[PDB]
Design a protein around this motif. Sequence first.
Motif, mmCIF file in Angstrom:
data_model
loop_
_atom_site.group_PDB
_atom_site.id
_atom_site.type_symbol
_atom_site.label_atom_id
_atom_site.label_comp_id
_atom_site.label_asym_id
_atom_site.label_seq_id
_atom_site.Cartn_x
_atom_site.Cartn_y
_atom_site.Cartn_z
ATOM 1 N N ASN A 1 -4.389 -52.820 -63.227
ATOM 2 C CA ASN A 1 -3.752 -51.490 -63.201
ATOM 3 C C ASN A 1 -3.263 -51.227 -61.791
ATOM 4 O OD1 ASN A 1 -6.618 -51.634 -64.350
ATOM 5 N ND2 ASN A 1 -6.043 -49.729 -65.558
ATOM 6 N N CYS A 2 -4.052 -51.545 -60.794
ATOM 7 C CA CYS A 2 -3.709 -51.216 -59.443
ATOM 8 C C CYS A 2 -2.429 -51.950 -59.000
ATOM 9 C CB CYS A 2 -4.895 -51.543 -58.555
ATOM 10 S SG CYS A 2 -6.439 -51.586 -59.365
ATOM 11 N N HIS B 1 -6.133 -52.585 -81.583
ATOM 12 C CA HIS B 1 -7.145 -51.994 -82.426
ATOM 13 C C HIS B 1 -7.661 -50.745 -81.684
ATOM 14 C CE1 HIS B 1 -8.691 -55.082 -85.587
ATOM 15 N NE2 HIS B 1 -7.452 -55.416 -85.239
ATOM 16 N N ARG C 1 0.532 -45.644 -66.169
ATOM 17 C CA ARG C 1 -0.856 -45.921 -66.473
ATOM 18 C C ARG C 1 -0.990 -47.435 -66.797
ATOM 19 N NH1 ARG C 1 -5.321 -43.546 -70.970
ATOM 20 N NH2 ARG C 1 -7.024 -45.034 -70.356
ATOM 21 N N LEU D 1 -11.763 -44.350 -59.785
ATOM 22 C CA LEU D 1 -11.478 -45.544 -58.976
ATOM 23 C C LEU D 1 -12.145 -46.782 -59.534
ATOM 24 C CD1 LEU D 1 -11.832 -43.722 -55.486
ATOM 25 C CD2 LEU D 1 -9.707 -44.425 -56.541
HETATM 26 C C1 FAD Z 1 -0.897 -47.202 -60.982
HETATM 27 C C2 FAD Z 1 -2.380 -47.138 -60.709
HETATM 28 C C3 FAD Z 1 -2.874 -47.636 -59.495
HETATM 29 C C4 FAD Z 1 -4.265 -47.615 -59.180
HETATM 30 N N1 FAD Z 1 -4.675 -48.100 -57.943
HETATM 31 C C5 FAD Z 1 -6.040 -48.108 -57.660
HETATM 32 C C6 FAD Z 1 -6.461 -48.555 -56.433
HETATM 33 O O1 FAD Z 1 -5.632 -48.962 -55.585
HETATM 34 N N2 FAD Z 1 -7.821 -48.523 -56.144
HETATM 35 C C7 FAD Z 1 -8.670 -48.041 -57.136
HETATM 36 O O2 FAD Z 1 -9.828 -48.001 -56.983
HETATM 37 N N3 FAD Z 1 -8.251 -47.523 -58.308
HETATM 38 C C8 FAD Z 1 -6.951 -47.593 -58.608
HETATM 39 N N4 FAD Z 1 -6.531 -47.114 -59.881
HETATM 40 C C9 FAD Z 1 -7.497 -46.539 -60.874
HETATM 41 C C10 FAD Z 1 -8.205 -47.601 -61.705
HETATM 42 O O3 FAD Z 1 -7.164 -48.265 -62.438
HETATM 43 C C11 FAD Z 1 -9.289 -46.957 -62.578
HETATM 44 O O4 FAD Z 1 -10.087 -46.113 -61.821
HETATM 45 C C12 FAD Z 1 -10.151 -47.913 -63.433
HETATM 46 O O5 FAD Z 1 -9.219 -48.819 -64.017
HETATM 47 C C13 FAD Z 1 -10.793 -47.197 -64.629
HETATM 48 O O6 FAD Z 1 -11.404 -48.133 -65.537
HETATM 49 P P1 FAD Z 1 -11.637 -47.618 -67.024
HETATM 50 O O7 FAD Z 1 -12.334 -48.741 -67.773
HETATM 51 O O8 FAD Z 1 -12.370 -46.305 -66.895
HETATM 52 O O9 FAD Z 1 -10.257 -47.221 -67.685
HETATM 53 P P2 FAD Z 1 -8.946 -48.043 -67.882
HETATM 54 O O10 FAD Z 1 -8.704 -49.128 -66.813
HETATM 55 O O11 FAD Z 1 -7.806 -47.037 -68.042
HETATM 56 O O12 FAD Z 1 -9.216 -48.799 -69.234
HETATM 57 C C14 FAD Z 1 -9.576 -48.121 -70.410
HETATM 58 C C15 FAD Z 1 -8.891 -48.764 -71.647
HETATM 59 O O13 FAD Z 1 -9.374 -48.089 -72.826
HETATM 60 C C16 FAD Z 1 -8.345 -48.235 -73.782
HETATM 61 N N5 FAD Z 1 -8.725 -47.259 -74.802
HETATM 62 C C17 FAD Z 1 -8.804 -45.880 -74.601
HETATM 63 N N6 FAD Z 1 -9.246 -45.318 -75.747
HETATM 64 C C18 FAD Z 1 -9.354 -46.322 -76.678
HETATM 65 C C19 FAD Z 1 -9.696 -46.283 -78.016
HETATM 66 N N7 FAD Z 1 -9.913 -45.096 -78.601
HETATM 67 N N8 FAD Z 1 -9.787 -47.479 -78.750
HETATM 68 C C20 FAD Z 1 -9.430 -48.687 -78.140
HETATM 69 N N9 FAD Z 1 -9.053 -48.742 -76.816
HETATM 70 C C21 FAD Z 1 -9.035 -47.557 -76.087
HETATM 71 C C22 FAD Z 1 -7.112 -47.868 -72.982
HETATM 72 O O14 FAD Z 1 -5.979 -48.323 -73.663
HETATM 73 C C23 FAD Z 1 -7.363 -48.599 -71.655
HETATM 74 O O15 FAD Z 1 -6.685 -49.834 -71.799
HETATM 75 C C24 FAD Z 1 -5.155 -47.104 -60.133
HETATM 76 C C25 FAD Z 1 -4.632 -46.682 -61.374
HETATM 77 C C26 FAD Z 1 -3.258 -46.709 -61.652
HETATM 78 C C27 FAD Z 1 -2.769 -46.207 -62.996
#
Ligand code: FAD
Lengths: 565, 565
Positions: free
Chosen positions: A42-43, A79, A134, A320
């Motif tokens: 994502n980053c 899914h 995102r 993060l």
């Molecule tokens: C452009 C951008 C740049 C970033 N840069 C940094 C950075 O430089 N340093 C840093 O620390 N953080 C950064 N981040 C933030 C970082 O990406 C997140 O903090 C971290 O990825 C969160 O992990 P997560 O598992 O909570 O969610 P996510 O990485 O968003 O993953 C969750 C997944 O769950 C899936 N999902 C949701 N609901 C369902 C469902 N009901 N059924 C099936 N699948 C589902 C979603 O599709 C998603 O793919 C950045 C984010 C973005 C968007």
Amino acid sequence: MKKILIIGGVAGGASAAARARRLSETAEIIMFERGEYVSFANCGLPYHISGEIAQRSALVLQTPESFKARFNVEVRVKHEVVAIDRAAKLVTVRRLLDGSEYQESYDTLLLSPGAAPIVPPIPGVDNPLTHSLRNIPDMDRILQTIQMNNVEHATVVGGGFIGLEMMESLHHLGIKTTLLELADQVMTPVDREMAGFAHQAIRDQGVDLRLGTALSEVSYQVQTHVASDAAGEDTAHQHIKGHLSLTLSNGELLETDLLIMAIGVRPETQLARDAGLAIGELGGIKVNAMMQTSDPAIYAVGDAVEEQDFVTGQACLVPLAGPANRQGRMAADNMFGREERYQGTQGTAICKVFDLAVGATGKNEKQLKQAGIAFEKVYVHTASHASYYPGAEVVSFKLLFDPVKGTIFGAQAVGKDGIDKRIDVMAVAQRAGMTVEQLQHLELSYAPPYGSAKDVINQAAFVASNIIKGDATPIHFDQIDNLSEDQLLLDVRNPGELQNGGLEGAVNIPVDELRDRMHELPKDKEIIIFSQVGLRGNVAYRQLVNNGYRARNLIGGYRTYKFAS
Amino acid sequence: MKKILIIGGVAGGASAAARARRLSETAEIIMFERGEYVSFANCGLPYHISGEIAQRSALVLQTPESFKARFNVEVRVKHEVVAIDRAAKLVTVRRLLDGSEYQESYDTLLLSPGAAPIVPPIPGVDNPLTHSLRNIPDMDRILQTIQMNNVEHATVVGGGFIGLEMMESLHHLGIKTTLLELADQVMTPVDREMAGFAHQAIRDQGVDLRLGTALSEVSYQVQTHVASDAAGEDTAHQHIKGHLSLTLSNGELLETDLLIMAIGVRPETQLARDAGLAIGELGGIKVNAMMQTSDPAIYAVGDAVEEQDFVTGQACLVPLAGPANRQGRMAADNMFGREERYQGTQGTAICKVFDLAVGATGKNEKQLKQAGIAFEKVYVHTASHASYYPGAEVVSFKLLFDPVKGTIFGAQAVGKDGIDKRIDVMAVAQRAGMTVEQLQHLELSYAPPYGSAKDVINQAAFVASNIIKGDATPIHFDQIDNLSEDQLLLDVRNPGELQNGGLEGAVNIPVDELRDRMHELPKDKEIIIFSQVGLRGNVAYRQLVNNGYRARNLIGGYRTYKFAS
Ligand SMILES: Cc1cc2nc3c(=O)[nH]c(=O)nc-3n(C[C@H](O)[C@H](O)[C@H](O)COP(=O)(O)OP(=O)(O)OC[C@H]3O[C@@H](n4cnc5c(N)ncnc54)[C@H](O)[C@@H]3O)c2cc1C
Ligand SMILES: Cc1cc2nc3c(=O)[nH]c(=O)nc-3n(C[C@H](O)[C@H](O)[C@H](O)COP(=O)(O)OP(=O)(O)OC[C@H]3O[C@@H](n4cnc5c(N)ncnc54)[C@H](O)[C@@H]3O)c2cc1C
Ligand SMILES: CC(C)(COP(=O)(O)OP(=O)(O)OC[C@H]1O[C@@H](n2cnc3c(N)ncnc32)[C@H](O)[C@@H]1OP(=O)(O)O)[C@@H](O)C(=O)NCCC(=O)NCCS
Ligand SMILES: CC(C)(COP(=O)(O)OP(=O)(O)OC[C@H]1O[C@@H](n2cnc3c(N)ncnc32)[C@H](O)[C@@H]1OP(=O)(O)O)[C@@H](O)C(=O)NCCC(=O)NCCS
Ligand SMILES: [Cl-]
Ligand SMILES: [Cl-]
């Protein structure tokens, strides 16, 4: 044998899936991802947009097939979990291919669904030229608008790190860019005076930076006329997919070819709410330190959950990647009964702003005043390495602390080099419970390419400690425009330096003439001293106090002052 | 008035002089320097020889005149203190212009006289073409010989930091270089397998690096024949200041045009010994933690003194500038009755070696073995930032620790990027008392230009903690060549990789086919596993151990093993 289901295939969930296999070969592990890809960077996404990351393949770190060969995890892409029934311990899943539905039982369940960009209640914002970033699909959409609508001007709204990255990427592509932020600064983890270094770097690149300014309305206007070379018209600056006309908070109009909304993310809580799991006051999922939700068989981690602030222990949202991966690994541990506790979030963050890095950890000054936590602050502006060796760069560094106990509250840094390192040092010193006085005794790496006999961090720790001990008496950039009749403003810089700027009504006595010219200053006025960065001011201060003057020294000197207005 | 006298006007003595005046305007402060310069950048000197620091003026940070204007300290250049009468509180001083002498009384005295290059008992070492590097005149003499003896080949003896810097600087001048070291490694603060990355890098640049080899004799041969253009000779490769013929300890001959002796430094102790001050078993001035010698009115700091090792609390010699500067400040605080205590030395050091940085803090595996302290180590080979964003470099990192208590004993790192950051973070963590397991919770700065979601240090914390808890079982690079009839060697890399090197007799089952191919491995044998960096090896170890095999993983992988030879 445990049946483990994991909702979301990226930072929290994929990290839990992998850990959980290393813990047990007998568990069944099913990982659901609504999107086409798991374990994507994502980053990475704003850097692929600019072409800085050339290869789209470099954004995908695992596949369904790799997760099966390596970790025997059944990953199911396209899914989406659409419900959790807790009592039955079953989830309902939709195959986005065809809309069909099925159920899957669990013994334990991890929710790692992340956070979705915030939708603002702006009229007309839903339209073919307005995108949030995102995922990979959001990225190909942006890229595809750039291409098809011959984007020559773009607007980004929100000056948090997603916004700044997208302004930078757009800029890198030769796109003229406007950034709007409603706050008086970009990057709120740092305070306003620190952000002033970033504002000036943003405007130096020709970016139209509009602080204190909101988007009020968006008007989308479909292109009705297709200019052509056949009708002998100029085609080079046409936008065949249409035009955006933006109304801002002061009623000026902004015309643009692309709009990027980057005004924050909010926790994905719809599944959790439907199933009746506790939700916290900030709108994230509520978890205890084991990462367990209100239901003991359901764990949650990442951008979806609320965390405990390391310094104050209150609820916070900190979306993060670091916290999400380490949480995910920990929920896998707990899931097999290890009872591990997550130790709170400091909010350590860093963002690239053209040539600058802007970094922070812990609590900022806005956060401390709001919580009624009494604090003091120091600035230094110290070379990133020994100044006589090429390539050294000023590190503007803020330290926030308890004036009595020396507790570390917060640190912020901005500069062209060596920021990541100073923020990390501070993040470990804070997590380890070091005070500002202990920070003095840090023994860091020095050779002239990399460091200095006294690091940025040692210097900060002396200045802060001098205040603690009463060997220094500060005033700040926001006090010094406001002087009384028994205070006398003294500029201890050399006179050549005053043409760059100074303070109305200062008397000028260069520090190296002060010992001798001191009888010029009257002893019945509090002498209010500033120099360029604070350091010469400190020497002067000490010469005056050692002679029985009352005095104060402007922390961070005229530099901090200059960038704070 | 307190009358303060300071012997040595550089890192220790100057830092004390400046702090002293900030503490007191009444104190009389006389600082003697036997050379011409105070406050020079000793560390800058090799970089000026190379021209990397263009201007000689950048090596001078204070002068007698600046120190008198700013700080009202009377600096006496070319005045050497030749005796101390402690009972009388008088020093005897010699003016080097005249050879004349006078007495000067003190209330308190600071000895910061540094350390002199070691003189080896090698016949013929004292000649016009051989130099050691302490100060600016030493430096100018090295410049002078290089110019006037048209130096085309040079030899440096000693593989610690001065010798590596002089080597790089000569190379950088186009001079063909030989580096001699008697130990089996350059840079003894890191262990020999970490030095092996530096060995390769020096060789890659075409430096003739000769380990385990000593210099037994030097032969200086004046030049009798001056070739000339008029006589119709080639004058390009002449050396009219002469020639060196070196005898090495294996009997070989080396012919060279310049010799640099860089074999370490010895504390300036003569003044203290003659005055009857205590000297330690290492030959340094013995101080307590308030930096006071055996005479309570006399203080001593810097390269001349023995320090207390942070980890063990025993005596040690660490001739570095960070400590010397912070000791000098503390001594001045102590001369005004503040009773502050220095907190021991870690030996945090870093040295540039062409494109590599080689860094360390704490104790090394050599020191730990000698002292009989039980330890364990781990390696990790982690990208310096998110490997999908360009410019990421491998950080090879060694961590040493108590396998049962989690005590941090030391850390080492080598690589092309981000070495200063990881050494600083580890120095902070050890000084603050963190254990390895507490290291797993570090929340460091991540954006793709600067870090990774789990940093080098988190990955090390994990790998080590797994050993502590029993979730991993190590074998190390120096054990894997043995192996009994009860052990089976298993390489889990892909077939393509054995190309680059491998371990004789290994069975090859690549990890992602392991789960399916597992029945191939007989369960009555401990399976000894290795992959490239040890990461796939760990995934493999877990699979087997969760299936009831006995297993070990090779920590650091083939990579650490390869550079160990
Ligand atoms: C452009 C951008 C740049 C970033 N840069 C940094 C950075 O430089 N340093 C840093 O620390 N953080 C950064 N981040 C933030 C970082 O990406 C997140 O903090 C971290 O990825 C969160 O992990 P997560 O598992 O909570 O969610 P996510 O990485 O968003 O993953 C969750 C997944 O769950 C899936 N999902 C949701 N609901 C369902 C469902 N009901 N059924 C099936 N699948 C589902 C979603 O599709 C998603 O793919 C950045 C984010 C973005 C968007
Ligand atoms: C080439 C080189 C590169 C280095 N690079 C690094 C580095 O990268 N990082 C690092 O941490 N350290 C480095 N150092 C080491 C660092 O310079 C020392 O640790 C530090 O300067 C020691 O400070 P000091 O006050 O003890 O001694 P010094 O700086 O040597 O000062 C002592 C002074 O006292 C004077 N003196 C001695 N006796 C008398 C007397 N009887 N009367 C009057 N004057 C006297 C001497 O002439 C001298 O100028 C380097 C050193 C050298 C030589
Ligand atoms: C990669 C991902 C699938 C997790 O896989 P993972 O195998 O747990 O992660 P890593 O490659 O970092 O390996 C970590 C494991 O290797 C071990 N390890 C690392 N280096 C090692 C080495 N050199 N020798 C031995 N073990 C090592 C660690 O101890 C850890 O194992 P453990 O958790 O059992 O202690 C997951 O983080 C992910 O999908 N990330 C990409 C998405 C993301 O994080 N995005 C955030 C926004 S950019
Ligand atoms: C320069 C030298 C003369 C000491 O001078 P100094 O005035 O003590 O050194 P600095 O410039 O680092 O200043 C430190 C003082 O400025 C103060 N300070 C630093 N930044 C400040 C800021 N921006 N605002 C207010 N005060 C500041 C510090 O608190 C410290 O004062 P304190 O010790 O009373 O707390 C001595 O270090 C020196 O001779 N160095 C070169 C010799 C040497 O170290 N060579 C060694 C190998 S390279
Ligand atoms: Cl200044
Ligand atoms: Cl590997």
